[PDB]
Fold:
Amino acid sequence: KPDKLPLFKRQYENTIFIGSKTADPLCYGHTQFHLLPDKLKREKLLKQNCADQIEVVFRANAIASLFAWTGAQAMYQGFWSEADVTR
Amino acid sequence: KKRFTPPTYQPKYK
Amino acid sequence: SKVTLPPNYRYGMSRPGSLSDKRKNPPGTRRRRVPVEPISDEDWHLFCGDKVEILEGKDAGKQGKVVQVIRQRNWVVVEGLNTHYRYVGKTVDYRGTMIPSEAPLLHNQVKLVDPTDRKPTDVEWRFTEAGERVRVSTRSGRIIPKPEFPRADGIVPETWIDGPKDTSVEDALEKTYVPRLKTLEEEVMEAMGIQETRRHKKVYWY
Amino acid sequence: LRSRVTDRYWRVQEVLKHARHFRGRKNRCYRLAVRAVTRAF
Amino acid sequence: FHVRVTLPPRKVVDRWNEKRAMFGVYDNIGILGNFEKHPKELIKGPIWLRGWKGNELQRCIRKKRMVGNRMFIDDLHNLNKRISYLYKHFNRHGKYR
Amino acid sequence: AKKGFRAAYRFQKELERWRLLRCPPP
Amino acid sequence: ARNVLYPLYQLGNPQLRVFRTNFFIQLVRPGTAQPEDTVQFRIPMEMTRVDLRNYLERIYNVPVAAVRTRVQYGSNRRRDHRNIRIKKPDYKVAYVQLALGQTFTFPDLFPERKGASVDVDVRDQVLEDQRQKHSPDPRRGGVPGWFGL
Amino acid sequence: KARGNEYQPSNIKRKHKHGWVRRLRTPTGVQVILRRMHKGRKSLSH
Amino acid sequence: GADRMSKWTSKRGPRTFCKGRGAKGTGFHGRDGKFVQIKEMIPELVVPELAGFKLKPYVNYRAPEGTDTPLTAKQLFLETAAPAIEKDFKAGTFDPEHLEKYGFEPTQEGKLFQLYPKNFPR
Amino acid sequence: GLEEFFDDPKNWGEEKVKSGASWTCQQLRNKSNEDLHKLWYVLLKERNMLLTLEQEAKRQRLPMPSPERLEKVVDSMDALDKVVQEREDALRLLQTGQEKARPGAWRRDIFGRIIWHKFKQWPIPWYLNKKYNRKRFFAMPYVERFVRMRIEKQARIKARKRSLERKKEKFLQEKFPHL
RNA sequence: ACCAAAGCUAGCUCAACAUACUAAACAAAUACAAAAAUACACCAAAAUAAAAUAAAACAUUCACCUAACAUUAAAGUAUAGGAGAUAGAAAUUUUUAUCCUGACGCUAUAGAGAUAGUACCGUAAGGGAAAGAUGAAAGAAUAAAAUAAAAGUAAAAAAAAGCAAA
RNA sequence: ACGAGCUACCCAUGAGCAGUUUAAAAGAACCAACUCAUCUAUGUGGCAAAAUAGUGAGAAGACUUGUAGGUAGAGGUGAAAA
RNA sequence: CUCGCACACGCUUACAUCAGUAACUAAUAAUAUACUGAUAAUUAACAACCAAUAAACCAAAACAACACUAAAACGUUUAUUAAUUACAUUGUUAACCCAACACAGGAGUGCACCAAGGAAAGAUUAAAAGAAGUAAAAGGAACUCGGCAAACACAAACCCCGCCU
Ligand SMILES: [Mg+2]
Ligand SMILES: [Mg+2]
Ligand SMILES: [Mg+2]
Ligand SMILES: [Mg+2]
Ligand SMILES: [Mg+2]
Ligand SMILES: [Mg+2]
Ligand SMILES: [Mg+2]
Ligand SMILES: [Mg+2]
Ligand SMILES: [Mg+2]
Ligand SMILES: [Mg+2]
Ligand SMILES: [Mg+2]
Ligand SMILES: [Mg+2]
Ligand SMILES: [Mg+2]
Ligand SMILES: [Mg+2]
Ligand SMILES: [Mg+2]
Ligand SMILES: [Mg+2]
Ligand SMILES: [Mg+2]
Ligand SMILES: [Mg+2]
Ligand SMILES: [Mg+2]
Ligand SMILES: [Mg+2]
Ligand SMILES: [Mg+2]
Ligand SMILES: [Mg+2]
Ligand SMILES: [Mg+2]
Ligand SMILES: [Mg+2]
Ligand SMILES: [Mg+2]
Ligand SMILES: [Mg+2]
Ligand SMILES: [Mg+2]
Ligand SMILES: [Mg+2]
Ligand SMILES: [Mg+2]
Ligand SMILES: [Mg+2]
Ligand SMILES: [Mg+2]
Ligand SMILES: [Mg+2]
Ligand SMILES: [Mg+2]
Ligand SMILES: [Mg+2]
Ligand SMILES: [Mg+2]
Ligand SMILES: [Mg+2]
Ligand SMILES: [Mg+2]
Ligand SMILES: [Mg+2]
Ligand SMILES: [Mg+2]
Ligand SMILES: [Mg+2]
Ligand SMILES: [Mg+2]
Ligand SMILES: [Mg+2]
Ligand SMILES: [Mg+2]
Ligand SMILES: [Mg+2]
Structure:
């Protein structure tokens, strides 16, 4: 189950947002920049006895952020589960 | 007068 | 693990925390109190493992070895002398192994027998000149040794094998204690070379 | 000295023995039997 | 009215025990002893009833006067209430007046 | 528990009478 | 340690050291699906994540990466014969995620024995045969078969 | 309109009205606790 | 109404009521609202080396026990300091003014692990 | 080193698992301080293993094989703790002379009873503590009545217990006429 | 024949004596919202008892009414009292040490409320029960023996007409 | 002694009123959520120790409502119904 | 047929898995979220705990441009001190709360009116009387204290009393 990641269920407004509203003429993007927090420092992970997870943190951050960004792009262009993306 | 007598319940052990 | 029993209790040869006892009397019942003659620990002469003779009953005048004693009701039991027949194997369509179980005997119906002349005698406790407190007989005037009985766990000290998790007698009796005035904390710290320079501040106690 | 009645069985029976041939609850209930027996006498 | 179905054990009481043999032995201690002690001193019981008799109100008053200061709180309160009730019943209630 | 022997002995008489009524002897 | 007064800390207090710990830990099989790197302990109510981490790092030398604790509440619903509630004790359950990628699986602590199973089957067959031989003959109709003639 | 549901539970209100600190902050509550202990109550307060 | 016989715990309260289960604190609250943990406050389990320790959790059954003689202050003094003071008195070097060499301590505030204040947990 | 919570693989399915007797206070006293310090952890590992085995037996609905090992280990732990505590008590009586390792006072709370109020560690003195100042250690002029009621109830309970014992001894004496 | 009925015990009550009087447990936490290790304070307080009743009403009065001086007399006296109901002394007298303590008190609708201040009823102060019966042995439950006697039913619904009986 | 967790009134802290006509957020108008309870019929040991169905009034205000606190009986509170 | 999801307050395991229901609970069975036994569970990022001391500070929230009266909660900056060092403690289940009950009643907030929740009928016959609904020849208030209720209407007026909300 995903609850052992750990992940927890919550109920609030489920929004699909690219960085601006749909009326923005810039419906596509170029690049993202993500600054790691103090919680995910290399020294912090080493003190927590985590050396292989330094790259895993970057991988998870990129996989979540870029996927959410591209999904927002696709659903702003009009593609969804039954209208799968063409390009 | 408005005379009203509330009912009395019995103990649950019976 | 000491199971606490209610003050109003009836003893039926069963362990106080046994399934048979819990079936005999549930924790919601308490029965009539039976009279028990006051006999202190210093006046109990019937131990387990000695040969005693039955005085009253269908099998009277017979001698047997004491196996169990119950001091709560002053019960002493002998193996297979005063018997009643009970079935242990019971199913829907089969019965068998009708074992002869043993009925209880009070201290009044049993008196100890000295091993010399094999006659029943009255046992009075005395204090010998050597500092030993041993039973003597008044009918004949002899002493009765303590009937050493094997314990309930079933392991004898004569034949024992030390396992991987058991120490030897040398390691059990090896004395290394150096009686000095240092605490265990300081002992361990100085043994391991732990260094602590700072000290505690002023702490108020109220 | 608490004193209670023990022969109440016989006290009731001495009255009920004369009402055994009656009809209804008068032959069983004691409250209904004393009046019936008195009127019978 | 359900009486017991079994005969009770016969109480084997002896009429020649120590108490039943020595009972009332020194009742004439004064008469036969060059009077020095009344039969009052032979009465064993409560402090306020050693050689005295009275009705319930008098007994309660006497008990309160002697041992009233050593009583317990609840028994003292009950004794006061009983004294008041007996006073009221004896003085204000009755038929012969 | 009512303290008494007369009631018990009278009820023993009545029990014997009931036994006699139920099973008559030869 | 539990049920032991701790020294109050101030600036300059020496390091707190416990030589004989009073904590006792159980290792329990998870009731739900759990990943490979997670290990489930039952710890006393006075145990923290750092206490458990030090416990496993020093006493057992286990490279634990993450600690997550929760408090499970014992049922107070059952009633005694006196209509008094019987409360099961609460307990702290902790999950430790290993660091170096070690895979842990709870072993089967009660493996059945083939010889024991064969002996039990033989005993059952013997009991069935005893019941069959003790069963009355239908052609007799209840007559005791002990008497010869 | 409909009555009988006058008890609306609230732990804060319960502890502030019949709690131990509320009982002991006044001498009358102390006397109440004394009476309950003398009677032998299993629960002196909430 | 509500229950009174059940214990008042953190589960049966509102969000603003969050009571601990009995564990000791490990720090304080810092500047930005975070919890700052002090490494001096956490208990450091001092574990020994059990590799070269030839002792088992159980004893030989055939080994005999001993007569119960609890340790006492007079016995401890006799085993530790009595021979030393006796030797010093025989040699004439016993000094009533200074008894620190025999193991006695004038004050407790000096050393690390103190007895009456009980600065050590265990 | 996560296998120390389990016993040897060859001893998992065994129906009966035997071991030695428990540690005795004299055997603990005979050892030195570091030996006891190491034996504490030696027995602690065994206790953890036994608790794990008991919990797993409960989970599998099977009886624990020879569960007396847990009680033997508990008795050994208690004996070691008692020996360490008696050494500490003797040493602290020798140095300071105080019987109890935690300071305290015999106080009289608002309820009229006498309480062994232990002392807590505070960074500030007693006259500057908000939580401690609002505490009361004295009895008000409405408490002596309840104190007398408590004396009253204890006296009545003791008297009726004495009468109970007297009646029991009587009934036994006239039930057994062996005198 | 069901329903049922009977045990003798737990224990209580009244006194006497008595050390002299808030039992045991107190490892940890307990007047933060009790059982929550840890921060610059506030802590604290006292001011008559009243009335239900009696005087057949009720205003003045109304002993006892949670303050030691006990017993035998003085004495229910002098006195105080809408001089009514009622209240009520003192001066002055008597009181010999210890054991002989148990019960013409009860036996589970009685005796403490108590198997227990627990369930339960109440927000709270507070109120507050009923419940046990075989036997030497149930490690003698293909288990054995005494009543089958209350009311209520079945065995066995009723046949003109009547306080149901004589 | 114990009670303002229901209710009467305050004190802090929050949250709600969609649509339509209107220069209006006007102690305006229609009608929702929401709040009260005019009339009738059932119910009367009932679903209920005050309810259900139909039908009604208010619905940007002297409006409802959540949490916490206060006013305690010779009194509190009250747009007086003792 | 459509009161569903979650959170706050409140109840504490009533939640989940396996097994049993002759009896105990469901106002009846089937069986079981409501009974019995055993074993497990709710893992934090959401929420609780989460600086003081002086000084600059009149200029509302209502899409806030700018205004009205009833004059309006909601904030930064500067300066002095703020242990400094991973991982602290606590709430995480539910068919649930208050009403004596598994009660047609009373319940705050954010979302949508179904993509989620459930079943009015245990099986028959279709007597009277009762409750609810639909329809009705001609009449259209002639019934009744009253046009109360109902109705294919849902309009115009006259008085008494209180200005009006
Ligand atoms: Mg958590
Ligand atoms: Mg109510
Ligand atoms: Mg309650
Ligand atoms: Mg809470
Ligand atoms: Mg909550
Ligand atoms: Mg941290
Ligand atoms: Mg009068
Ligand atoms: Mg009169
Ligand atoms: Mg009058
Ligand atoms: Mg008066
Ligand atoms: Mg005059
Ligand atoms: Mg007059
Ligand atoms: Mg009784
Ligand atoms: Mg009959
Ligand atoms: Mg006739
Ligand atoms: Mg309030
Ligand atoms: Mg309020
Ligand atoms: Mg609007
Ligand atoms: Mg309007
Ligand atoms: Mg309606
Ligand atoms: Mg209609
Ligand atoms: Mg309208
Ligand atoms: Mg209008
Ligand atoms: Mg008046
Ligand atoms: Mg008034
Ligand atoms: Mg008026
Ligand atoms: Mg009027
Ligand atoms: Mg409930
Ligand atoms: Mg059923
Ligand atoms: Mg269940
Ligand atoms: Mg949930
Ligand atoms: Mg039907
Ligand atoms: Mg019809
Ligand atoms: Mg009709
Ligand atoms: Mg119609
Ligand atoms: Mg028509
Ligand atoms: Mg007309
Ligand atoms: Mg007409
Ligand atoms: Mg109309
Ligand atoms: Mg009209
Ligand atoms: Mg019209
Ligand atoms: Mg007119
Ligand atoms: Mg008007
Ligand atoms: Mg106008």
Remarks:
- The two ends of chain H are 31 Å apart (CA to CA).
- The CA atoms of residues 16 and 22 of chain H lie 6 Å apart.
